[PDB]
Amino acid sequence: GDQIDTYELSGGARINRIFHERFPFELVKMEFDEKELRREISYAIKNIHGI
Amino acid sequence: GDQIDTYELSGGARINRIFHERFPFELVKMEFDEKELRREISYAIKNIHGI
Structure with missing residues (x-):
């Protein structure tokens, strides 16, 4: 239309x-714990290889 | 599997x-008596030659 405020x-x-x-911004307001991620990744790798 | 602890x-x-x-390590925790080995080797050599 032609009626613009x-x-x-x-x-x-x-x-x-x-x-x-x-x-x-709502997608960006979240924290990352570098040390917890590294510990969890290390344990994940060791457990995945199993025996 | 995909369930990793x-x-x-x-x-x-x-x-x-x-x-x-x-x-x-269990293969490495064992002692060697250098002097008993040398004495035993000397007697072994002399006895093996016999007469």
Whole structure:
């Protein structure tokens, strides 16, 4: 349409697109324990080879 | 299988492998009496030649 609000954001049309460009942060707020990963990998390797 | 215990050793699968890589010490914990060997060798040589 030709009725455009030039003061605010249009609402869902651009708020939902901001959510879609915000979601990449929720995928990044998570920690990694380097030492626990290395210990678990070492034990996993030794156990997988078995005997 | 895909079920790997990453905290402990898997048990027999790797404990038996530690026994198999431990056994080389039981083959090494034994003494040699250099002087008794040399005396015995000397007598063995003299006795083997007989007369």
